Paper text:
NSP2 is a multivalent, nonspecific RNA chaperone with high nanomolar affinity for single-stranded (ss) RNA.
Due to intrinsic flexibility, the linker region was poorly resolved. We analyzed our atomic model of NSP2 to evaluate the distances between acidic residues within the CTR and the basic, RNA-binding residues localized to flexible loops within the RNA-binding grooves.
Numbering used by the authors:
A (entry chain F), B (entry chain C), C (entry chain E), D (entry chain U), E (entry chain D), F (entry chain A): 1 to 313
């Protein structure tokens, strides 16, 4: 998680704003700067190295006494900054929305993975510029089209159907916010189209999930892509997603939530998220998560046995 | 796959036989040696380096035109040979049984792993010599007590409750017959005590198996320990075990065969092995392996769900 | 051993076909792709990475379950694909030949040795483009000129005359179907001028062969170049050639077989290949190969002894 | 090529002599010593480092102005020296033959190979001391036993029959006097038992030689073991074996020569060595070497063809 | 020591000759070529790799049975070949001299050092092309202006006053014809201007020579530059220069000699080379080299003392 | 340059003194101690690590604000300390001489070279304990014997005749007080037998010196061994030794001086040291050093030419 105000800053074109990145050494210098408690929100100027973000975000960068911030001493920082610039400048930004446009939250891992799949010379985000442009727009939130496979968050395919795609997030090769654990592994599943999916395709996806990844749980953060993560973190995501909905109950922010087909999503998480979007209580709604309730072993029958007897060849 | 006549040869003690290993240099010499007919099954004497096994086994040693044989160019060879010596010498051998005692088949990987287990100082096969002696006797076949956990084939533990132990065979660090394939992962499961096992322990084992290892199929080779291997090779084992029974239907060896609890072993493999030991046809009996069965997904009910909602915290 | 439909695919220009290579990432994605039956011979579209060959050829790519296919995770795959592209596009292809043009078998090692030759700037396949076109076009099989030295399959020279050239195939530095063995050495011998050859040159070549390579046997595959391999594999070649002639007795397929001068080719292999082209049994004709028959130990007199007393200084 | 006066020196037991090695530092010191032209054969005493060989041998040690001498700056120089100790100390040496027993020429490479052999704990020269003692006695020349296989000069076995053994001299890992060339490779062939040999064993040796080593010639230095070397140096050996005989025509030293069986040895070299033993002229006798005399390709017939149709399976 | 026929060959412009280098792979191929007699002195054509020098020069290339010729496998070969081409083409070569122009002996080390100095940008043979051209002309022997400092053969400067320059030849970093000896150091001293030199400069040079290089002896080969080499190799140079004057006594080639000042050159070598050029006996003239001749110890007096008491500060 | 009170301290045997080394950790601890200005010369007690030398020597040990002291963190410190202990304890020490016997100066490099000589198992200071004992005695100044060769200060020999030995001090592989320069090189020349030396040996030493080392000057510090050092550092020695005599003019200290044969020692340094021992002024006597006075170039005649003409063969 982070704000867009940590990769660029606006600069007047006398009509509109051109966004410009920061310099590693510049923000490095600002980190050790010290200024009065009156101007701790306006952008700082490391006189030698250029502009640098305000001291307000001083606690969001990897310093000596706090390493829980974004690492910025790596080329990936300038890469993602140049990407955000190249994307935002095309979008004509006004002077009354840029105040909040530069504050749209974004999991910087998304942008990092966009960068990794953009510099590869085979991903179609290498040839077609407008595709990458729309992709970064969506990854920032300035578009309406939900993320689809053509504009997905990258990674290596691990399974594909005629209507789906199962990316395997590799959050261990990153250089901005790499995960400490060497055991953390998380899958994403996106759609190739936005049309009502058939039943045979969903049957195949359910088969592959409940066979090769039965040690994982299928959830969703409310956008158009099934997240998949180990049960040993479900309780996390709920709370981690709960605020994302709760803080969106506050006016001026969109509460648009997208739950997917209950056939594949985890039925317990399905009911929990339904009662969440319903408008129920804070914690008593989460109580339905730990409520062990599963009469059928798996949602459907006669499927795992099919793969069992299939792979025997 | 190996015969005992590739690590030792008998020598006369005027009352019994002392078995002595080979010098890897001596076998290497005999390999590129040549002798006339009528003597290709008589022990050869590399005059410079000592005795060496007859040229009969010439095609069973790792040379640059036949890599399908055992290696001898590593210290593991002399180690396993010295172990076989230390074991067989104590067992008093006659002058009319060594003829086929030195021909008892043995999975060289078993002896290799037992060696790599006796050298680690933390295992009880380091202190108690008689335990090591009994274990090597079992691994050779000169005793009746089936293998138990105290005398298992080594490897790193993965799961135990009170009557089971799930060894994870590591066939990728061996230096005698290391598996060329990168994806060769096999799990053995042995008993802690030969007494009839309760039902709670079996239910716990089936839970752990059908949760953490549902991509595997529990089979047995007819001895007292559950094998575990991917379905993508189960068929092999059938044929790979079939001769082991068929070549035992002819006299000269015992046809003794052990089953396990039908409640865990893969019921298709169970019925196949049952109709195998029954005495039916060769391939028409194998036909029951490919015959789809099990109109339910798992043998028990409401078990995987318990582990699902268990790990949620 | 491979088919042309694994390096490129056709694409319409509204007049003719342009051939386009694959993206290794795209074919790796297709590998895990699951598609319904009745369609598993159609070119697949990895939505993210471009087109990819149909799943029909799934079993012919180096994965973790099948390491017996063409490797593609190296740059040599894209290199040879671009070479085949640069080759075929020049040849104006119709819409009634690409059906079986992309099915002409080709020893992938041949194209590998080509691409390892066009990049070494010393050779003339670095300067004259049309020579390279003709060379790879022959290697694909779309012309009637047999391979000559100017257009040979590369490798390092080891001996020459006024009419011959003895390449030493190096199948150990390849990356596309490299030989697993470290003791597989094979020699090729090609002609410089397709016109009939004299007798002094053949005397010289037979001298050099029966002196420096008397531990090798001279055979052919039915084209214009003497293969040379250790006797310890002749039998293999036999059957590996037999099907090539057997599957070609099918009508509509060229069965034109070229046998070279009997004066140097292995007389037993010569008679076998003659009785093969005559048209006879499968194995009873092969029986002439294993039949020992040698009236004169070598077909000439005064060459081995000549080199013996020659090299004395 | 070396004299025994470069590894040890005699010392008085008041009754007999104990032979003591040199300190490599002491010989290095003497190397840069300068003494008057009156005592340039007396043993020099590097006062700091113990006795050192006389200055007469200055030209026989490797310095930066004469690198054609022995290398002593490696550990091997001590080993071989100590190895000579346990040889000569046992043999009671007379106060009248130490004058010339320390000048018996010896190919240092022989002793180096033997010391490499005695340290490999699998050879029988590691267990039985008296065997090592006898072997060093032979390699020095103080016994009449011709060097059999048990006492061979060591190396890697390559081929073995019931009466022969074909060592492959490895003169490239020697740290005392390696070869000026780095493609040099030379084989030795010794007899297992000094008694006469049959006609089947010799025929098999001739077959193996004319098949796997037809690019070599079988010669002999006069002792009881067939040397085997490339024709491209045979002439050298001639003069190298000429002087060692001619200098033995100078009475006072034994000229005992032993040419081996003619059926295997190179017939031209056989006739040359015979006319050498006759006492004929110097150069007109060598003239028979370069002269091409080819009645028949070999005193045997039907051997190359036999191995040809043998290896075919 | 080399001939010009090992780096280029002539090619017709229908009017004049363009010289073209050899593809090292092509000469490597020719090395193994076996062409009939009567044609062994005409340029060979490795059909695959281009032209290559005739087989006459076969024994002048570093192979594994003759390591006494020039190496060609290194990039320095193509470098010096391109240099010789770039130089010779400017010179208008006729059709009645090229036959002997391509046979002018040249110390390959000279060209090697010249190319290793023309790549270092600080040297003036980097900027001025015509200077490089004149220098290579001199090094080939197609002009009359003796080598001066501006056109010297490179190396590290060690000493300069006004009229001399003392290069330190580094024949150990070369890659074409390096010195197998690890310890070989040979200095050269060239003039700065062909005009007569004063006495103070010569006295300074003699001081520096008889002080810093007392362990060397100044000689000259017959050019305008003093050689300097250890006394331990004077004699060699003697005969090495003797043939150079002797073979030039044959008419058609220049026999001139440029003896330098008598005050600095080794007076014994001075008198010897003078009696050489006088036209006297072959070896009785060389006897003047070993005959100790001393009119004075050193041609100057009271000079080493000046440098002794000079450096004391 | 060091004082003996930096490797050991005395301890009471109730009758005499046992000398014991320091622990490098203990002295490192003492270095950072801060004791009152009343006891800065009493031995300190780093109570954790054992006794440590007084803080008086605080500035004599290497620390990161004073690196001009003696490194002690290496193993050679404990080595030389144990050597000094092993030497001093054997010597019976009173209770009124330990006051100043622990203050007799010693060139730490001398003891370092001793310990690097004692561990080399080929020198006679390895076997004979009493020899090493007398050597370490004289290296401290507790004996009358001048340092002969049998007890020399180690190093590698470079030249010996019958009464001299030219060690080449290697002050670059040391660890206690190594030299920071790469150009510093110093030779020592010691006598073998303290008896008067003849003329032939002296002439030979002068030959070797004025030929191979004419870029060095021979001096003496006032003991029985010629130092040899570059002229570029005579003056330093002239003053470095001067105090060594001047501070010995103080009553109660020995000023014995041993100037050697003027025939070989630098005659200017000879006269300077003579007028030094005479008892004259400080700088007006040193003035004779920079005075240039050299009628004969060297005290001998016709000697350099001898080696000149000698080395020619």
């Amino acid at each position: 998680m982070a704000e867009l105000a940590c990769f660029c800053y606006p600069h007047l074109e006398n009509d509109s704003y051109k966004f410009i990145p920061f310099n590693n050494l510049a923000i490095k210098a600002m980190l050790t700067a010290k200024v009065d408690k009156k101007d701790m929100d306006k952008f700082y100027d490391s006189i030698i190295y250029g502009i640098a973000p305000p001291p307000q975000f001083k606690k969001r960068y990897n310093t000596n006494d706090n390493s829980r911030g974004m690492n910025f001493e790596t080329i990936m920082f300038t890469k993602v900054a140049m990407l955000i610039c190249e994307a935002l400048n095309s979008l004509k930004v006004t002077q009354a929305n840029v105040s909040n446009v530069l504050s749209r939250v974004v999991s910087i891992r998304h942008l990092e993975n966009l960068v990794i799949r953009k510099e590869n010379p085979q991903d179609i985000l290498f040839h077609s510029k407008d595709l990458l442009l729309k992709s970064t727009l969506i990854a920032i939130g300035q578009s309406k089209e939900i993320e689809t496979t053509i504009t997905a968050e990258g990674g290596e395919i691990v399974f594909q159907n005629a209507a789906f795609t199962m990316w395997k997030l590799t959050y261990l090769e990153h250089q901005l916010m790499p995960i400490l654990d060497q055991n953390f592994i998380e899958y994403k599943v996106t759609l190739n189209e936005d049309k009502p999916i058939s039943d045979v395709h969903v049957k195949e996806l359910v088969a592959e999930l409940r066979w090769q990844y039965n040690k994982f749980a299928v959830i969703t953060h409310g956008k158009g892509h099934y997240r998949i993560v180990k049960y040993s973190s479900v309780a996390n995501h709920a709370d981690r997603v709960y605020a994302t909905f709760k803080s969106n109950v506050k006016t001026g922010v969109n509460n648009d939530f997208n739950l997917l087909d209950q056939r594949i999503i985890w039925q317990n998480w399905y009911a929990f998220t339904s009662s969440m979007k319903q408008g129920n209580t804070l914690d008593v709604c989460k109580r339905l998560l730990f409520q062990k309730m599963k009469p059928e072993k798996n949602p459907f029958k006669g499927l795992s046995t099919d793969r069992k007897m299939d792979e025997v060849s």
